[PDB]
Every structure is written in C-alpha cells, then in structure tokens.
C-alpha cells in the first residue's frame, strides 16, 4: 500500500539555522551525523541535536494550513502534502498563534473568525461513564452559590 508522507517544519535558533543551512546546501552525508531528531513519548516534546549540541523542542500546531506543491515545469503544481505542525527549537502551549509568513502574525487572534475547539466531547464522555456506573442521578440547574 501507499502511506501519505508526513511533512512538518523545523524552526531552529538563528546561528544553528545558519549552520544547518550551510550543511544542507553543501550536500554531503556529514550533515546526517551532525543533525539528529529525538521525539519524546509525550508527542509534543523533543531534542534536535545540531553538531551534537542538544536543543529543546516543542511540536506545535499551526493556525493556518500549508500545502507543499511540487512542480517540474514551474507552470503546473501538484499538491504533495499538508503541513500543520512545526518543531520549534531553542494543550494551549502546543498551539502556535502566529503564521509562518510575515503578513500572518497574530492570525489566530485577529484574522480568524471566532471558531470552537472542535475537548468538550471527551469531557462529556468522561461524565457519561460515571453516570452509567452509578445508581441514582440528580440534575439541578443552579444559581449563585
């Protein structure tokens, strides 16, 4: 079978980004030893090791949706993957408010129409299980108390 490739964006500190960029544009396999990525079983934490120097990483959710588009003639472009995550290196914390481009900054706060967390469904599933495992249940809409 075929599994859709999973592309994400890696953001590095600027000096480490310059060393990684120089090693990528060089093209040797020396970069392969120099740059490693360890993703922790949290799923939202990691180390990126540039030249064997550890950097602390967080995999965050991006507010917009990006799409990689490949081409052979620079006139027709074929969509290859959807990018929604970024492993910035240096829950609410794992959500990035800004977009990658310069015009998109504070997009989630200003350029996004109010949208719901769809979280609440999981919380309702937790309450329903407790109700069904009880004997009696007493609902009461309340006032200030």
């Amino acid at each position: 079978p075929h599994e859709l490739e999973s592309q994400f964006i890696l953001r590095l500190p600027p000096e480490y980004a310059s060393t990684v960029r120089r090693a990528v544009q060089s093209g040797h396999v020396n970069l392969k030893d120099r740059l490693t990525i360890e993703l922790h079983p949290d799923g939202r934490h990691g180390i990126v090791r540039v030249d064997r120097v550890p950097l602390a990483s967080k995999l965050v959710d991006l507010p917009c949706v990006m799409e990689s588009l490949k081409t052979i003639d620079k006139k027709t472009f074929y969509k290859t993957a959807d990018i929604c995550q970024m492993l910035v290196s240096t829950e609410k914390k794992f959500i990035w408010n800004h977009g990658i481009t310069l015009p998109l900054k504070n997009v989630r706060k200003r350029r996004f129409r109010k949208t719901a967390k769809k979280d609440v469904e999981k919380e309702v599933k937790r309450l329903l299980s407790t109700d069904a495992e009880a004997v009696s249940t007493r609902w009461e809409i309340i006032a200030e108390d």
Partner: protein, 495 residues
C-alpha cells in the same frame, strides 16, 4: 485543462479516503504526526536526518532525459504514487489566509499559477516577469475587484477555486522535514505563497441533497468496480466485508443495492461467500470509471462533511458561513443572478478584510388644471431654480411640480438599480485592494449562559465491601453543560 496525477483521477484511497470519522473530520487537512508501530522510526531514540540534494538533481536530470528522449516537448510525469513525494522536484509552500476554506485540494491534484497583468493605459513596458506561472493579460478582472493599470496579480487557478496568491520569502530559520517510516529527510524552502480569499468555482452540495446522495452512490459504485478490476480469480469475485471496511457508515442494504446489478452472491459450492461478477455484465473500462466520479466532486463532498461536523460540534449565522451556502452565493453572483453583501458574518477574517459570500437581492388632474401661470407661482414657492421656471413648458413644469409632490400619509385605528449595483461594485474593489495590501505587506507585525446558571450532578455509587457514598459534582463550564443536558433531554425522549 487541469491534469491531475494518475493516483488522483483514479481516486486511490490513501489520497482520497472512502470514509472519514469524527476525529478525522475535525483534523481535516490538519493531519497530526502519527507514531509508527513498525519501522525504523518506531524504535525510540535519536534519528539522523538525511540530506537529499543528490536525489533531487538525479531525479531532475532523469526527468530531463525522459523529456528529451520523448521529443523535447512538455511531458506528463506524475503517473505513480511515488512521483508525488516531496523528495524531488521544486517544492513551494502555500499558506492559506482563511481557517477553513470552502474548497481545498486533496493530495495528488494539480493547480496552475496564472499571472494576471492589466496593461497601463496606452504604452506599457510589459508584465513584470515572475519566477512561477504563465502570464495572461486580463481586461476583465477574474476576481471581485478590478486590477489597477500596470498591476500584476498572481493566482492559483484550477477547477475548484481561483485565489490570489502572494509570493513571500521563507523565514531564515525554517526547513522542511519529510518523515517516512524509514527516516527523516530535510529540504530547504525558499518560496512561500500566501493564498487570499478563495473565489469558488465549484458548488459544494448541501447535506442530504440530491447531488450529495448521488456522489455517495457513485463513489461506492466506483470503489466496487475497482475492486472487481483488482480481482484475480477469473469470474471476478469480491468480498462484502472489504466494502464494509471501506464504507463502515453505510447500511449494508445500500451496498447490496449497488451489488445487486453487476454481481450475485454464491452461498454454496465454489466461490462460496463471494460476490461473483455476472457473466453478461461488461465491467466498465478505465475511462468510463474515470468519467463516473471527478476528483473535484470528492473535494466538494469532503468540504460538505467537514463543515457538517464543525457545525454539529458547535451546536443561523454559522449556517450562512457553511460552504454550500457560500459557494451557491458566489456562483450565483458570478452569473449575475444576485448580489452579495461584502460586509457580513460569512467574512472568514472576522474583521473588515475579506469578503462575505451570502446572497442579497439585486433590489393628479388638478396639477394639469393649474393653468401654467399658477404652476409657475407654485414652482417659485417651492424653491425650484429659475431655469425650470424660465422654460415654462406646461407639461415639464407640471411634471416637476408632481416630482416635488408634498408626500403625506397616515391611517387611524430612490434608485433601486444603478446606485445599489455601483455601491456593490466599488465596495468589492475596495475590499479586494485592502486584502491585497495586508497580505503583500513585508512589514513586521508586533506580537500582541443566557440564564447565568451552572450545572450540579448528585449521584449514588456502592464502594467495595458495603458502602453507599454520594458524590455531588458541579460543572461551571457552559460548554460542558450544553452537551451534557442536550444528551439528557434527547434520552428523556428516547423512551
């Protein structure tokens, strides 16, 4: 004119899914980073990324050899799923301004970049040249606004939408990591476009529509035909629970309706518990199966069911922002049926930038007995200018006095065409110009219930050995409240 990849026009499941559940509809076009169970990345630890530069230039040299061996013209290369990897070719990135667009391309589909260039009045030097796309000279603006003289605007153009794009350079810190089961791979990116508000060219169907049910039936039929083509046994035969694995929300009556014509069930003997193909039935060829369902219809269906999920999760303003309504409104506005309020609640920005695609409609005897002279004195009394009094044309003077009128009404116990159309046209251009300026800006931007009643639930459980403790739990979140009590009210009516 748009030629998608052979995985896209054949509707392969990895790229075009048969069924999307609720957690996969909430993560629509935002696929999370999945953990592998088997493979090299499934083992926990540090993993080296691998630089592909030799792979990119080897594949590009190989494709140029293929093109020059085939006569040197333009070729079609995307024939396999392995052609659609990010490991080769010139990648650009494309960011979207809206959170959830009305239409969005699946993986494997093609789009074109058109550079619309309105010439200057009289002499013009020529289109400012651009790295990507082909240039076309547009007298009639494709978008809602109109291009300025000497303004080049790039745009994504395909069968799904048409949207203005703006080339920005990438950040100096960001690279692109393509992870697969075997390892990590790294590219740099240099070009990233920002895609403005889409102008939809395909109408998303509504839920339970006739077009919606027709697409569901045709998609199931195409999947059944392609399973029959993949079958190796001579009287081609399939299994029902393959289709039940692909379409699990379908009632099996509908699947048996699709299999009733073109197949029959063998219970005993050879081919037992298989749906063999009927001997008189000619299985359709590849081009007929491609003519059954189009990929853009699948994208419109995916947009409909994703919007169905988002609306369902969020408990009439939201219903107007649903893509079937907005796509119908925009396509009707493009034929000239109706106009759109460009400021409204369907605005995907939430501020004054961007448009909203929701429909608005495009919409006494004695005066003659005045005997010219007294009508002249009346026109003098009302304050009519002396030119109209001076011509003194009986019929014109009476018509002007009738136009002056005096109104009045009470009981007891005015352009409707040009002005309305002109205001809509100017506002569309103003919003379009504002959207272009905000997205183009390389300027850095500084980082920045009704009842008032909570819900309390008391209960009764039995502890180990013998006990009867009661727990009183108070829910102060109005969101948890609504979902909780909605289910309770539904249950009160399930019996």
């Amino acid at each position: 004119i748009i030629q998608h990849s052979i995985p896209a026009v054949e509707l392969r499941q990895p790229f075009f899914p048969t069924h999307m559940g609720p957690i996969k509809l909430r993560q629509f076009h935002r696929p999370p980073l999945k953990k592998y169970s088997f493979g090299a990345l499934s083992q926990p630890g540090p993993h080296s990324v691998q630089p592909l530069l030799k792979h990119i230039k080897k594949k590009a040299k190989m494709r140029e050899q293929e093109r020059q061996a085939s006569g040197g013209g333009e070729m079609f290369f995307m024939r396999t799923p392995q052609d659609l990897t990010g490991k080769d070719g010139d990648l650009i990135l494309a960011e979207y301004s809206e959170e959830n667009g009305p239409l969005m391309m699946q993986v494997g589909m093609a789009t074109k970049i058109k550079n619309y260039y309105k010439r200057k009045p009289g002499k013009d030097p020529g289109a400012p040249d651009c790295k990507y796309g082909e240039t076309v000279y547009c007298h009639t603006s494709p978008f809602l606004g109109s291009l300025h003289p000497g303004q080049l605007l790039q745009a994504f153009e395909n069968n799904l939408f048409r949207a203005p794009i703006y080339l920005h350079k990438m950040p100096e810190t960001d690279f692109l990591i393509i992870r697969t089961r075997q390892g990590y791979y790294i590219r740099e990116l240099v070009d990233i476009f920002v895609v403005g508000q889409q102008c939809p060219l395909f109408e998303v169907p509504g839920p339970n529509s006739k077009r919606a049910n027709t697409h569901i039936r045709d998609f199931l039929q195409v999947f059944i035909y392609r399973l029959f083509w993949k079958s190796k046994d001579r009287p081609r035969r399939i299994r029902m629970e393959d289709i039940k694995k692909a379409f699990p929300s379908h009632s099996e009556s509908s699947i048996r309706k699709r299999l009733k014509l073109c197949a029959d069930f063998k219970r005993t003997g050879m081919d037992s518990n298989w749906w063999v193909l009927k001997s008189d039935f000619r299985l359709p060829t590849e081009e007929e199966i491609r003519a059954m369902v189009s990929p853009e219809q699948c994208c419109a269906y995916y947009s409909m069911i994703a919007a169905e999920q988002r609306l369902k999760d969020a408990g009439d303003d939201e219903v107007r922002t649903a893509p079937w309504n907005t796509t119908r409104a925009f396509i009707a506005a493009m034929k000239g049926k109706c106009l759109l309020e460009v400021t409204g609640v369907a605005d995907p920005t939430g501020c004054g930038e961007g448009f909203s695609y929701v429909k608005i409609p495009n919409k006494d005897a004695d005066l003659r007995r005045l005997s010219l002279k007294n009508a002249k004195q009346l026109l003098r009394k009302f304050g009519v200018p002396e030119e109209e009094i001076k011509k003194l044309s009986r019929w014109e003077v009476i018509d002007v006095v009738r136009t002056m009128s005096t109104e009045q009404a009470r009981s007891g116990e005015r352009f409707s065409v040009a002005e309305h159309q002109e205001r809509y046209k100017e506002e569309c251009q103003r919003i379009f110009d504002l959207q272009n300026k905000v997205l183009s800006s390389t300027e850095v931007l500084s980082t920045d219930s009704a009842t008032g009643r909570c819900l309390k639930i008391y209960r009764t459980f039995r502890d180990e050995e013998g006990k009867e403790y009661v727990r009183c739990e108070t829910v102060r979140k109005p969101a948890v409240i609504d979902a909780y009590v909605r289910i309770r009210t539904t249950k009160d009516e399930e019996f």
